[PDB]
PDB file of C-alpha atoms and ligand atoms in Angstrom:
ATOM      1  CA  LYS A   1       0.023  -0.217   0.184  1.00 22.72           C
ATOM      2  CA  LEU A   2       2.488   2.599   1.433  1.00 20.22           C
ATOM      3  CA  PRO A   3       6.251   3.449   1.664  1.00 18.62           C
ATOM      4  CA  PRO A   4       8.236   1.796   4.077  1.00 18.12           C
ATOM      5  CA  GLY A   5       6.670   2.209   7.938  1.00 17.05           C
ATOM      6  CA  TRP A   6       3.415   4.323   6.926  1.00 15.41           C
ATOM      7  CA  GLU A   7      -0.051   3.355   7.814  1.00 19.14           C
ATOM      8  CA  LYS A   8      -3.429   5.549   7.997  1.00 17.16           C
ATOM      9  CA  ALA A   9      -4.471   6.715  11.386  1.00 18.45           C
ATOM     10  CA  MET A  10      -8.098   8.842  12.066  1.00 19.55           C
ATOM     11  CA  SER A  11      -7.310  12.345  13.541  1.00 15.73           C
ATOM     12  CA  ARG A  12      -9.325  12.609  16.597  1.00 19.08           C
ATOM     13  CA  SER A  13     -10.478  16.017  16.314  1.00 22.94           C
ATOM     14  CA  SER A  14     -11.370  16.907  12.945  1.00 24.82           C
ATOM     15  CA  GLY A  15     -12.261  12.627  11.724  1.00 20.22           C
ATOM     16  CA  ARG A  16      -9.868  12.971   8.892  1.00 19.72           C
ATOM     17  CA  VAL A  17      -7.389  10.330   8.250  1.00 20.09           C
ATOM     18  CA  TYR A  18      -4.141  11.053   7.303  1.00 20.20           C
ATOM     19  CA  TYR A  19      -0.906   8.928   7.466  1.00 16.01           C
ATOM     20  CA  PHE A  20       1.775   8.364  10.712  1.00 19.04           C
ATOM     21  CA  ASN A  21       5.348   6.673   9.622  1.00 17.97           C
ATOM     22  CA  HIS A  22       5.914   3.997  12.926  1.00 17.58           C
ATOM     23  CA  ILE A  23       9.604   4.496  11.774  1.00 20.46           C
ATOM     24  CA  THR A  24      10.639   7.878  11.323  1.00 19.68           C
ATOM     25  CA  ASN A  25       7.194   9.313  13.632  1.00 14.98           C
ATOM     26  CA  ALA A  26       6.165  11.559  10.968  1.00 13.65           C
ATOM     27  CA  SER A  27       3.045  12.582  10.550  1.00  9.59           C
ATOM     28  CA  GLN A  28       1.447  14.148   7.756  1.00  9.70           C
ATOM     29  CA  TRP A  29      -2.454  14.839   6.223  1.00  6.14           C
ATOM     30  CA  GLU A  30      -1.211  13.911   2.777  1.00  5.27           C
ATOM     31  CA  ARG A  31      -0.527  10.091   1.494  1.00  4.78           C
ATOM     32  CA  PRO A  32       3.321   9.287   1.278  1.00  5.49           C
ATOM     33  CA  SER A  33       5.140   9.572  -1.910  1.00  4.94           C
ATOM     34  CA  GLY A  34       6.858   7.393  -3.836  1.00  4.75           C
ATOM     35  CA  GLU A  35      17.587   1.487  -0.180  1.00  5.93           C
ATOM     36  CA  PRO A  36      20.960   3.945  -0.770  1.00  2.00           C
ATOM     37  CA  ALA A  37      24.248   3.160   1.074  1.00  2.00           C
ATOM     38  CA  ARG A  38      24.486   6.517   2.687  1.00  5.06           C
ATOM     39  CA  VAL A  39      22.542   9.005   3.790  1.00  6.18           C
ATOM     40  CA  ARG A  40      23.226  12.599   5.148  1.00  7.65           C
ATOM     41  CA  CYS A  41      21.001  13.787   7.997  1.00  7.05           C
ATOM     42  CA  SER A  42      20.962  17.101  10.050  1.00  8.09           C
ATOM     43  CA  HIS A  43      19.604  17.014  13.575  1.00  8.52           C
ATOM     44  CA  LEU A  44      17.885  18.710  16.498  1.00 10.63           C
ATOM     45  CA  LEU A  45      18.925  16.969  19.439  1.00  9.65           C
ATOM     46  CA  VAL A  46      16.765  17.356  22.793  1.00  8.14           C
ATOM     47  CA  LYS A  47      18.901  15.830  25.199  1.00  4.52           C
ATOM     48  CA  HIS A  48      17.253  14.744  29.251  1.00  3.73           C
ATOM     49  CA  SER A  49      18.099  13.891  32.584  1.00  4.19           C
ATOM     50  CA  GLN A  50      18.151  10.022  31.337  1.00  2.00           C
ATOM     51  CA  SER A  51      19.898  10.879  28.490  1.00  2.00           C
ATOM     52  CA  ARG A  52      23.802   8.984  27.824  1.00  2.00           C
ATOM     53  CA  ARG A  53      25.369  12.613  28.940  1.00  2.00           C
ATOM     54  CA  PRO A  54      23.238  14.608  30.380  1.00  2.00           C
ATOM     55  CA  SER A  55      25.641  17.752  29.565  1.00  2.00           C
ATOM     56  CA  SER A  56      26.173  19.941  26.398  1.00  2.00           C
ATOM     57  CA  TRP A  57      27.242  22.766  25.307  1.00  2.00           C
ATOM     58  CA  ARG A  58      24.411  24.840  26.124  1.00  2.00           C
ATOM     59  CA  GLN A  59      24.389  23.335  29.407  1.00  2.00           C
ATOM     60  CA  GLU A  60      27.034  21.758  31.537  1.00  2.00           C
ATOM     61  CA  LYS A  61      24.058  19.777  33.652  1.00  2.00           C
ATOM     62  CA  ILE A  62      21.077  18.842  31.702  1.00  2.00           C
ATOM     63  CA  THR A  63      18.128  18.206  33.895  1.00  2.00           C
ATOM     64  CA  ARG A  64      15.748  18.229  32.202  1.00  2.00           C
ATOM     65  CA  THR A  65      13.020  14.974  32.575  1.00  2.00           C
ATOM     66  CA  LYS A  66      12.508  12.724  28.953  1.00  2.00           C
ATOM     67  CA  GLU A  67       8.839  14.194  29.639  1.00  2.00           C
ATOM     68  CA  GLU A  68      10.231  18.081  29.787  1.00  2.00           C
ATOM     69  CA  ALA A  69      12.505  17.548  26.459  1.00  2.33           C
ATOM     70  CA  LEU A  70      10.053  16.091  24.404  1.00  3.10           C
ATOM     71  CA  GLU A  71       7.445  19.154  24.900  1.00  3.15           C
ATOM     72  CA  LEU A  72      10.541  20.644  23.482  1.00  2.00           C
ATOM     73  CA  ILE A  73      10.773  18.803  20.415  1.00  2.00           C
ATOM     74  CA  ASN A  74       7.070  18.772  20.215  1.00  2.00           C
ATOM     75  CA  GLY A  75       7.230  22.772  20.294  1.00  2.00           C
ATOM     76  CA  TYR A  76      10.437  22.974  17.902  1.00  2.00           C
ATOM     77  CA  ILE A  77       8.306  20.560  15.641  1.00  2.00           C
ATOM     78  CA  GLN A  78       5.729  22.704  15.684  1.00  2.00           C
ATOM     79  CA  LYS A  79       7.618  25.933  14.299  1.00  2.00           C
ATOM     80  CA  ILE A  80       9.918  24.082  11.342  1.00  3.71           C
ATOM     81  CA  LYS A  81       5.956  23.057   9.961  1.00  2.65           C
ATOM     82  CA  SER A  82       4.601  26.115  10.720  1.00  2.00           C
ATOM     83  CA  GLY A  83       7.339  27.660   9.147  1.00  2.00           C
ATOM     84  CA  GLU A  84       7.617  30.239  12.258  1.00  2.00           C
ATOM     85  CA  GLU A  85      11.112  28.501  12.284  1.00  2.00           C
ATOM     86  CA  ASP A  86      13.896  26.911  10.432  1.00  2.00           C
ATOM     87  CA  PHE A  87      15.012  23.863  11.165  1.00  2.00           C
ATOM     88  CA  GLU A  88      18.382  25.050  10.726  1.00  2.00           C
ATOM     89  CA  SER A  89      17.955  27.828  12.601  1.00  2.00           C
ATOM     90  CA  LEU A  90      16.647  26.231  15.852  1.00  2.00           C
ATOM     91  CA  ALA A  91      19.264  23.787  15.780  1.00  2.00           C
ATOM     92  CA  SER A  92      21.656  25.848  16.312  1.00  2.00           C
ATOM     93  CA  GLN A  93      20.278  27.585  18.644  1.00  2.00           C
ATOM     94  CA  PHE A  94      18.988  24.335  20.932  1.00  2.00           C
ATOM     95  CA  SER A  95      20.592  21.788  19.766  1.00  2.00           C
ATOM     96  CA  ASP A  96      22.248  19.733  22.586  1.00  2.00           C
ATOM     97  CA  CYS A  97      24.706  18.111  20.458  1.00  2.00           C
ATOM     98  CA  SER A  98      28.462  19.145  18.494  1.00  2.00           C
ATOM     99  CA  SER A  99      26.845  20.039  16.188  1.00  2.00           C
ATOM    100  CA  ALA A 100      25.081  22.729  16.188  1.00  2.00           C
ATOM    101  CA  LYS A 101      27.577  24.325  15.193  1.00  2.00           C
ATOM    102  CA  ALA A 102      27.031  23.267  11.904  1.00  2.00           C
ATOM    103  CA  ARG A 103      23.114  23.859  12.025  1.00  2.00           C
ATOM    104  CA  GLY A 104      22.594  20.987  13.112  1.00  2.00           C
ATOM    105  CA  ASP A 105      24.596  19.194   9.719  1.00  2.00           C
ATOM    106  CA  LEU A 106      25.894  14.780  10.907  1.00  2.00           C
ATOM    107  CA  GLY A 107      27.367  14.601   7.496  1.00  2.00           C
ATOM    108  CA  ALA A 108      26.612  11.693   5.430  1.00  2.00           C
ATOM    109  CA  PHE A 109      26.673   8.221   7.186  1.00  2.00           C
ATOM    110  CA  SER A 110      26.083   4.547   6.263  1.00  2.00           C
ATOM    111  CA  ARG A 111      24.076   1.337   8.446  1.00  2.00           C
ATOM    112  CA  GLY A 112      25.915   0.806  11.547  1.00  2.00           C
ATOM    113  CA  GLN A 113      27.304   4.013  12.609  1.00  2.00           C
ATOM    114  CA  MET A 114      24.378   5.460  14.612  1.00  2.00           C
ATOM    115  CA  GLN A 115      22.265   4.732  17.075  1.00  2.00           C
ATOM    116  CA  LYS A 116      19.923   2.424  15.773  1.00  2.00           C
ATOM    117  CA  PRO A 117      16.229   4.176  15.910  1.00  2.00           C
ATOM    118  CA  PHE A 118      17.839   7.472  14.678  1.00  2.00           C
ATOM    119  CA  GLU A 119      19.743   5.242  11.633  1.00  2.00           C
ATOM    120  CA  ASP A 120      16.158   3.418  10.616  1.00  2.00           C
ATOM    121  CA  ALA A 121      14.418   7.196  10.586  1.00  2.00           C
ATOM    122  CA  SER A 122      16.997   8.721   8.631  1.00  2.00           C
ATOM    123  CA  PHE A 123      17.020   5.758   6.287  1.00  2.00           C
ATOM    124  CA  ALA A 124      12.922   5.448   5.816  1.00  2.00           C
ATOM    125  CA  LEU A 125      12.623   9.372   5.582  1.00  2.00           C
ATOM    126  CA  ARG A 126      12.469   9.942   2.115  1.00  2.00           C
ATOM    127  CA  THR A 127      14.925  12.671   0.606  1.00  2.00           C
ATOM    128  CA  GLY A 128      13.636  16.268   1.841  1.00  2.00           C
ATOM    129  CA  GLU A 129      12.068  14.757   4.659  1.00  2.00           C
ATOM    130  CA  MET A 130      11.851  15.559   8.818  1.00  2.00           C
ATOM    131  CA  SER A 131      11.047  12.462  11.174  1.00  2.00           C
ATOM    132  CA  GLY A 132       8.817  13.346  14.133  1.00  2.00           C
ATOM    133  CA  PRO A 133      10.468  12.843  18.016  1.00  2.00           C
ATOM    134  CA  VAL A 134      13.079  10.010  17.638  1.00  2.00           C
ATOM    135  CA  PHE A 135      14.303   8.155  20.613  1.00  2.00           C
ATOM    136  CA  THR A 136      17.206   6.966  22.012  1.00  2.00           C
ATOM    137  CA  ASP A 137      20.030   7.021  24.517  1.00  2.00           C
ATOM    138  CA  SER A 138      21.563  10.674  23.209  1.00  2.00           C
ATOM    139  CA  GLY A 139      17.320  12.382  23.436  1.00  2.00           C
ATOM    140  CA  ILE A 140      15.051  12.632  21.790  1.00  2.00           C
ATOM    141  CA  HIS A 141      16.356  13.940  17.816  1.00  2.00           C
ATOM    142  CA  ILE A 142      14.536  15.340  15.405  1.00  2.00           C
ATOM    143  CA  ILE A 143      16.163  14.466  12.122  1.00  2.00           C
ATOM    144  CA  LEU A 144      16.217  16.430   7.962  1.00  2.00           C
ATOM    145  CA  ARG A 145      17.439  14.376   5.769  1.00  2.00           C
ATOM    146  CA  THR A 146      19.457  16.263   3.359  1.00  2.00           C
ATOM    147  CA  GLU A 147      20.920  13.804   0.809  1.00  2.00           C
TER     148      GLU A 147
HETATM  149  C1  LIG B   1      28.927  15.453  16.122  1.00  2.00           C
HETATM  150  C2  LIG B   1      29.298  16.651  15.239  1.00  2.00           C
HETATM  151  C3  LIG B   1      29.530  16.555  13.542  1.00  2.00           C
HETATM  152  C4  LIG B   1      29.947  17.864  13.548  1.00  2.00           C
HETATM  153  C5  LIG B   1      30.517  18.344  11.804  1.00  2.00           C
HETATM  154  O1  LIG B   1      28.914  18.016  10.981  1.00  2.00           O
HETATM  155  N1  LIG B   1      29.783  18.917  14.514  1.00  2.00           N
HETATM  156  C6  LIG B   1      30.302  20.021  13.940  1.00  2.00           C
HETATM  157  N2  LIG B   1      29.831  17.482  15.367  1.00  2.00           N
END
């Protein structure tokens, strides 16, 4: 029926069907469009107190809860999707990763290199697409596939 990992869902508030991807946690009203050795992605990481290393260039001690970190991720996604803010701008300002200084760019990578949930979402994204919240041991990611 649908590309890898997509399924139909029903909006609780509107009754209109939509499409959810259980690998990338993307969700959209439009039916999804249309694997490479390498992909190139950027990401915006929000760390939390249970992160593998609860520190970052933004905060020596990251003390926010996973649920608080998810709410921050949800809000950033909202501003990206509404166009109030660009992914690159938010990543530079708020990503708890060292890649913030490169607007979240991680470069290209193969399978076997990243944390698995991150890897799977990256390779399930189509070029240009952005994930929903992706959970790894580092924290919570918004992933943007650029190549
Ligand atoms: C991790 C990581 C990767 C890169 C380069 O894009 N930075 C700055 N930090």
